[PDB]
């Protein structure tokens, strides 16, 4: 829409009050003209037709419970855009300021959120397993990171390349959660998963086995469900990323942590310069070792810690 840029105020899914960038033209719309070609948030109105209607509001105040998921989808797409721009010098997901579009209230009782290839889509959850999925900044950033991956490495969504694809989304989803300093941790989806159970989450990067996912290449899933285990086998890479950052001893192998910031620079470089659509875990290790080498030198501690971490999860 063409109109005047302004700032509105609302409440997110968790009840927190935040300011959001809107556009005025008769109604106030969830259209943020301050980032790239814009961030646009739509109402799918409980249907599956996309994208739905661009979200329009009469008074620029979004405190209705139906507004909540839109406020957070809009606001956390802005935080993720800022992360990639400020930290990685990337402008939007295609690197040339593509517009970011999201639809909320997709379908009814839908327990998922996803990047479909062109935009973000968020379910409201059924109220028991999940609450509206855009209230989780690591979910929003996880999904937005699939759009980055699609434009750069292009990892196909199955077997080991799909598991890398998923791990890369968990890593960056987690780094964005630390960047916003929103009660950060290494778990995924804990703010929106099971409102009735405290302390759990969908997955854990620091201990994937807590929820049954593999934390070592010898325990990988080899069947056909889940497109060959893309959400299960990502545990092996997630555990490696956690060790590179935080350090620890895993199956007797000790890793000195080098921190989150270098973790993000190594993996972003590996993703945008060395990974290809069919990369497997072994070529992820080579890509991360080569990235760390480019950035810090072949005799750095950073290179040593990348090697130890993949050795600890059994990836040669
Ligand atoms: Ca209103
Ligand atoms: Ca958290
Ligand atoms: Ca988290
Ligand atoms: Ca819970
Ligand atoms: Zn994913």
Residues 210 and 187 sit within 8 Å (Cβ to Cβ): no
From CA 151, how far away is CA 90, in angstroms rounded?
Answer: 12
- Tell me, in angstroms, the distance from the centre of ligand 2 to residue 81's CA: 19
6-154 is classed CATH 3.10.170.10 = yes
Ligand in closest contact with the CA of 66? 1
Residues 27 and 58 sit within 8 Å (Cβ to Cβ): yes
Resolution for this experimental structure (Å): 2.0
Helix (H, G, I), strand (E, B) or coil at 221: coil
All residues at 6 or more sequence positions from 257 whose CB lies less than 8 Å from its CB, including other chains: 243, 244, 245, 246, 247, 248, 305
State how far the alpha carbon of 197 is from the alpha carbons of 140, 193, 202, in Å.
21, 8, 12
Ligand in closest contact with the CA of 183? 2
State how far the alpha carbon of 41 is from the alpha carbons of 35, 47, 71, 305, in Å.
13, 15, 9, 41
Residues 113 and 13 sit within 8 Å (Cβ to Cβ): no
From CA 34, how far away is CA 134, in angstroms rounded?
Answer: 21
Ligand in closest contact with the CA of 11? 1
Task: Tell me the CB-side half-sphere exposure of residue 161, using CA atoms within 13 A.
Answer: 14
Residues 235 and 203 sit within 8 Å (Cβ to Cβ): yes
- Show which residues are catalytic: 143, 231
Binding residues, as ranges, are 57, 59, 61, 138, 142, 146, 166, 177, 183, 185, 187, 190, 193-194, 197, 200
Tell me where in the chain the CATH 1.10.390.10 domain(s) lie. 155-315
Binding residues for Ca(2+), as ranges, are 57, 59, 61, 138, 177, 183, 185, 187, 190, 193-194, 197, 200
Q: Distance of alpha carbon 104 from its chain centroid, rounded? A: 17
From CA 213, how far away is CA 258, in angstroms rounded?
Answer: 25
φ/ψ of 258, rounded to 5, equals -115, 0
From CA 280, how far away is CA 92, in angstroms rounded?
Answer: 26
DSSP letter assigned to residue 190: T
From CA 207, how far away is CA 16, in angstroms rounded?
Answer: 29
State how far the alpha carbon of 27 is from the alpha carbons of 1, 71, 96, 121, 218, in Å.
10, 16, 29, 23, 57
- Tell me, in angstroms, the distance from the centre of ligand 4 to residue 189's CA: 9
In the chain the first and final C-alpha atoms are separated, in Å, by 52
Return the CATH superfamily for domain 155-315: Neutral Protease Domain 2 (1.10.390.10)
Q: Residue 232 is encoded by which pair of tokens? A: 């299960």
Q: How many CB atoms lie within 10 A of CB 241?
A: 27
Tell me where in the chain the CATH 3.10.170.10 domain(s) lie. 6-154
From CA 270, how far away is CA 296, in angstroms rounded?
Answer: 14
Q: Which of 91, 96, 94 is nearest to 81 (CA)?
A: 91
From CA 174, how far away is CA 177, in angstroms rounded?
Answer: 5
- Tell me, in angstroms, the distance from the centre of ligand 3 to residue 205's CA: 9
- Tell me, in angstroms, the distance from the centre of ligand 2 to residue 167's CA: 17
């Amino acid at each position: 829409i063409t109109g005047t840029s302004t700032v509105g105020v609302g409440r997110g899914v968790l009840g927190d009050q935040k300011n959001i960038n809107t556009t005025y033209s008769t109604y106030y719309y969830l259209q943020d003209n301050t980032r790239g070609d814009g961030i646009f948030t739509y109402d799918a109105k409980y249907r599956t037709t996309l994208p739905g209607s661009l979200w329009a509001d009469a008074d620029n105040q979004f405190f209705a419970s139906y507004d909540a998921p839109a406020v957070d989808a809009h606001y956390y797409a802005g935080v993720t855009y800022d992360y990639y721009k400020n930290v990685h010098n990337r402008l939007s997901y295609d690197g040339n300021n593509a517009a970011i579009r999201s639809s909320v209230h997709y379908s009814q009782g839908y327990n998922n959120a996803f990047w479909n290839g062109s935009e973000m889509v968020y379910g409201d959850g059924d109220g028991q397993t999940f609450i509206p999925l855009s209230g989780g900044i690591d979910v929003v950033a996880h999904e937005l990171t699939h759009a980055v991956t699609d434009y750069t490495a292009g990892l196909i969504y199955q077997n080991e390349s799909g598991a890398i694809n998923e791990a890369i989304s968990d890593i960056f989803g987690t780094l964005v959660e630390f960047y916003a300093n929103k009660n950060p941790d290494w778990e995924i989806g804990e703010d929106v998963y099971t409102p009735g159970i405290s302390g759990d989450s969908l997955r854990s990067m620091s201990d994937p086995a807590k929820y049954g996912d593999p934390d070592h290449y010898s325990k990988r899933y080899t069947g056909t469900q889940d497109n060959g285990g893309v959400h299960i086998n990502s545990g092996i890479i997630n555990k490696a990323a956690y060790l590179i950052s935080q350090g620890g001893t895993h199956y007797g192998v000790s890793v000195v942590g080098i921190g989150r910031d270098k973790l993000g620079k190594i993996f972003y470089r590996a993703l945008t310069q060395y990974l290809t659509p069919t990369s497997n875990f072994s070529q992820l290790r080579a890509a991360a070792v080569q990235s760390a080498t480019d950035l810090y030198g072949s005799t750095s501690q950073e290179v040593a810690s990348v090697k130890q971490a993949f050795d600890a999860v059994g990836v040669k």
